[PDB]
Amino acid sequence: MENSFKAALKAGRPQIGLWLGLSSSYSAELLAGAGFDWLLIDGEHAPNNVQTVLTQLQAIAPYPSQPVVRPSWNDPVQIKQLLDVGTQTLLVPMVQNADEAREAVRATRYPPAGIRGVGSALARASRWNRIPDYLQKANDQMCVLVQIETREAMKNLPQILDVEGVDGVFIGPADLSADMGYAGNPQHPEVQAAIEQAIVQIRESGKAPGILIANEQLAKRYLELGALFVAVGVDTTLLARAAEALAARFG
Amino acid sequence: MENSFKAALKAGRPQIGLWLGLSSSYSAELLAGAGFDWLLIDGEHAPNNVQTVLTQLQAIAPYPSQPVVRPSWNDPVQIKQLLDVGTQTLLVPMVQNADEAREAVRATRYPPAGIRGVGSALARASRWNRIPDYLQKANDQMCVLVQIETREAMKNLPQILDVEGVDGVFIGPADLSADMGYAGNPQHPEVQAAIEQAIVQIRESGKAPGILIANEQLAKRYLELGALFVAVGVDTTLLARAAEALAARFG
Amino acid sequence: MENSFKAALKAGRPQIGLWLGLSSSYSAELLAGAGFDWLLIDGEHAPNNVQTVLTQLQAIAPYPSQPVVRPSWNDPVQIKQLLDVGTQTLLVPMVQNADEAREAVRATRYPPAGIRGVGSALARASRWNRIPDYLQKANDQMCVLVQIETREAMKNLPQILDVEGVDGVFIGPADLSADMGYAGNPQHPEVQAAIEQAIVQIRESGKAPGILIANEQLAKRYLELGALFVAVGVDTTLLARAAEALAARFG
Amino acid sequence: MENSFKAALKAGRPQIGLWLGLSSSYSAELLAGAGFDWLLIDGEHAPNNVQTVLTQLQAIAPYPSQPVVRPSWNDPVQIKQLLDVGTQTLLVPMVQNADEAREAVRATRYPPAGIRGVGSALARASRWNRIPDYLQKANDQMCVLVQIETREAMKNLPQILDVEGVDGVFIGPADLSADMGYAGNPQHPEVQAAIEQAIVQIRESGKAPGILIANEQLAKRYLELGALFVAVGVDTTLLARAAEALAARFG
Amino acid sequence: MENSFKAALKAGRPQIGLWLGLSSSYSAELLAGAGFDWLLIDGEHAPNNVQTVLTQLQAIAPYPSQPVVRPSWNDPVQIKQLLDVGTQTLLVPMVQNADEAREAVRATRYPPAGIRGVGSALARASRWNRIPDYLQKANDQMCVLVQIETREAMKNLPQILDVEGVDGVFIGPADLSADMGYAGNPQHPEVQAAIEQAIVQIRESGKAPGILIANEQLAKRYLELGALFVAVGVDTTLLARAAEALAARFG
Amino acid sequence: MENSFKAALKAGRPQIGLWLGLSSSYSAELLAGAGFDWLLIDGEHAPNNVQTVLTQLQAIAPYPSQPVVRPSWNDPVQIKQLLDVGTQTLLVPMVQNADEAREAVRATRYPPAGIRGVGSALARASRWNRIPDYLQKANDQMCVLVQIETREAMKNLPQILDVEGVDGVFIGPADLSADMGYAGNPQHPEVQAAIEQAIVQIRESGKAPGILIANEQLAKRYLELGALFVAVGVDTTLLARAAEALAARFG
Numbered sequence A, B, C, D, E, F: 001m002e003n004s005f006k007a008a009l010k011a012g013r014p015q016i017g018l019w020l021g022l023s024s025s026y027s028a029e030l031l032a033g034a035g036f037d038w039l040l041i042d043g044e045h046a047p048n049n050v051q052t053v054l055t056q057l058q059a060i061a062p063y064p065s066q067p068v069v070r071p072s073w074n075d076p077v078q079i080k081q082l083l084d085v086g087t088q089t090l091l092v093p094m095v096q097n098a099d100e101a102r103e104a105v106r107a108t109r110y111p112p113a114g115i116r117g118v119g120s121a122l123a124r125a126s127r128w129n130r131i132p133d134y135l136q137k138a139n140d141q142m143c144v145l146v147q148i149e150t151r152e153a154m155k156n157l158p159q160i161l162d163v164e165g166v167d168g169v170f171i172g173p174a175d176l177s178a179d180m181g182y183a184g185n186p187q188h189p190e191v192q193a194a195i196e197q198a199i200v201q202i203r204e205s206g207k208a209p210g211i212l213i214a215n216e217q218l219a220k221r222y223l224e225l226g227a228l229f230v231a232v233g234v235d236t237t238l239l240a241r242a243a244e245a246l247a248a249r250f251g
Ligand SMILES: O=C(O)CC[C@@H](O)CC(=O)C(=O)O
Pocket: A045, A147, A171, A172, A173, A174, A175, A176, A212, B118, B119, B120, B121, B122
């Protein structure tokens, strides 16, 4: 049950990802064989729940691509449920300060290091108690990634980076640009500057910078600055744009 | 993506509605062709979730009847998820004061006017970014209806009506009568008086009064007093009572 | 595991029924408490399969109303699957002659009386081998009802009535009227006479006549004539018509 | 309930299509807004059934793109069920001769023109008896497309083209090439000639030629030759190839 | 709608239970016929939600085994939703003090005794208003069981036992042992002592002690000390261990 | 895409199996980790379809246990659909003679060796055209197992064994005993002799004998005799019996 995504980040190996919002175990398997290092199962902005996350994890399992799950918010109860169905890497939205980052971390760890509720007999996480000493091994294989999405979060970045258990910090350009006054449009120089400065700062602390960016030139720019988990497209977008282009070429 | 239900309320056109608690995209389509101005998809008192709301919205889409969705509570996270699958008109339960009404409104609006999280690439709401300038157009087509269900809420009605973005105020007779000490039985004169006084007061402020009432005489009475969104039946009730009556006529 | 619907037909007690086309375990429970003697789960003209039949049987189980299932056709494989999830009373469409009636009967019976495949360990039918001597008790509690829907079938009715195991014969006025050249108008005198004559002939043979008819006056006529399983309405119709009428009363 | 796809074929307007194998009502809606004239819901080679077809029809309904459904085979029972959930245009696989083409046609038509079973009260097809005179209007809006996939079928093409009710003939290059001894390589000259000759012959008979081809140059050739319903891509392929290419650009 | 599990506890009749984490209405029915007094539908540590709880309640209904439901946390909104689909006995996790116990109780009761929201027309709980005077009868048939899972909870046990409406107190050995510093391993003498002392103390107050324990010797020991609701196994464990043992016996 | 179960039979390595009738992707994963060589997903006697087979295959995929699928009957259409979602090993019920065995084999093979329809772009089988030369590699990795369940089939066994492509012959004791006049009691000497003799004859022909038997002593006897794929239990039975026994130990 070693977390290979977590190990790759710690070793400074950049991980190229794809965002999954189609909310389907079928398309999830199809995309799990496409060659990405990681796949983001979005429980915040796509119609997913614990049950559909579970089936997407099952679909993805035999492939090399590693699953990352985003809960709808920094909720210890939801986090608990996602962990028990087998989630090991979390992308937690709207983390505003060090306290909230710490809460996210503690929600993924069994006491005394955290408040994770025990239910291994019932959980896919322990393979229903087949994994020996699961309760002792689980904490170390949890990978917690926190999203900074506001000016407030940006101010607090230094303290957030000081939180043990925070393995990565993800910058969401859409929410960030909106909070900065550019209505979801990240292209503006002020937004780009904040993003790139944060990436440098995150990597400087030894933690992993992450971002979602569909512009491939910007993706490489972010990678060059030291970003370690970079999602470079979204399944819904890839499908819609390719279908639209195709239709247009035939009038 | 113009909100026609919202426009109708603002123009003082009464909207006749049906409550949907069958939690099925199939019966939802069947009822969408029955001639109602609006349909209430109940996520509070029927076994619905974001996923089943989505399929009921899809079923209803091609019909003239306009969908309204009730979340299980005034939860910004749940509200966010419902909006992204395409919800534009919300009926928010247990709004007790102006602060809570304001929170409901802000949960439906992108910054700076609100705290709505951005995820349009993934969302049916923007038709996966097919709607041009979606982020700039969305706020104005959101219609927020708040429920007053207690004596406390009734005291605070004047302040609630002062909240910008509150387009309508819905009175729930069941909860209200229970809170007033008449165990869900709204017939009592004290309950009726509170209801009718509120309706007059709501309309006086230029906002839309709403109510659910299965008694058709009371429905017309409420309409006469200026109610603008009136649900006049419930799918489960219509089905159960008609089936029971039918069976009884054959012994 | 006694088939009470079968026993009632055999004792000449008329059974009043409702047709279920909403294909939902939820509305199925709601209607199971409405007071009908039987409920028809329609696998021919509603979007059902073995799986949704199963969930509707589970929903109905604790209520007095007895379930009857209609497969999409006289198919031994499908019949086998429906029996194993617990179906004891079948309504088989488009039975044209004695050979086809005999095939329907034999599909429901274990060898040597029939060709029903054995899989009791797996099946809800035996409550997973919890019912003692299930393999010996099963055959006698199967109730086979065959549909006559064409002039050819009407002609072969005497022979169909002579098939052992055919417990009842159901007349579908819609299909019959269509075959007679009056598509969708069973009202025509020639159709009503054929129906009346069939009902009398069936009852005189010592077997149960059945029919679906939404017109309550005709239903009572057929009951007067000796029909023993009479469905007097359809769930989709009850709901649609009640809803449309309600909407109309408010313009 | 007018069949606009059928009308377009009859008027000689070419229809550009996309194949749907993702078996999801969600991705179906996403693609329904992409600008295609028609969408093929594949019940033969994708994991669909009557139920998932229904939800995909509901998702597609409000969009301009017209749905076409392929049953798993030329099965009158399955065809009956697909029609009742609202299917008006069918693509029937493995039609080998005129008799089988005639059977396909008659499965879609009410007596006396066909053997379609009557169940309008229950069916989305008539919007639950809300469409007036449905039983009289239905036959004329059915559009039957038959697949020729073997040398035997090619030989019988003249006779198949003479069957009234066969509105179009579709050539499946994959199956045809396999039958001709070039499994999975329609590129071979002998195959292309057979395809071209069939298209010309179909169009000259006054009926619509159809084909699926992912190669955009060949698609344009077949259109040049007079093909009237041409699917130019497959959803699973578009998604898989776009995703794989994206991943490859980042190594 | 009498709560027989609740009555049995009040009468001091021990109830033997099985834990359900397979999250399936099918296996739930299979196990409902296995002879247990109660069944725990786990919404905290198994992938269940309100919808799947509903279908498991439907599956279990006709059997003697009584359903108990565990929500994911002490959430009044979730509790409301579970009650309306028909839940009457709740096992509430992580109850730390008398205030939290009181909140749990009040969430299950209609005003004035609680804050339960009224929606009986829509609810399976009232059988869609078929149960006469449901609103007046419901409160008394609610059975609230609270879990004590930490040292803090243990300190507060005396006050928790003083809370009216708390019918039972459940000790979770896994969480408790973890909080005490024995990583989910309850065997340690310190854990066992706390557990047995609590059981004696709970029963002394006239309330029901409960526990889950797969060790059958420990189960009888707890019963001897006065425990009244004792779950003696878990469906996932029973299945996994039996399958593993079987496979091993054949190499 | 190599069929390891097929290779093992061919090499004479006995394969120990478990029957899956719980029809759940969740319990399927749980059991896939229990150490069996193969798992039988039953589409004949459990409520499965192509869709649930697909999800069970996805759940099982990362585990060593190899999936085998039983269609509801020897149906080329259904077989086609099962193969396209990725089924490589089939257990075909009620194969009565050599012609039917040959039909089963040809349904699994692309022309000219068979009649398998081509749809690789759409199918999980080729991982959506990601497996190179799939159309050329597929035939050889198909493994066809036929069930003999009647005296007629026993009589035709020598001819069935002569059909190329029949890799194994499975004896179902329940159905066979029923056909021989001992319904549900394979224990009878005449039945055991028929079974033993069939196993020997199958193995002597150079093909794999198979059987399901819950009695562990008989299983070992059949293995001794040369049976190569032996299912030694059923998931529903294991669960039901373990649960019932546990409940009984507490009275
Ligand atoms: O492109 C989108 O709108 C969908 C994904 C975002 O919500 C990802 C995110 O967290 C962010 O960058 O704000």
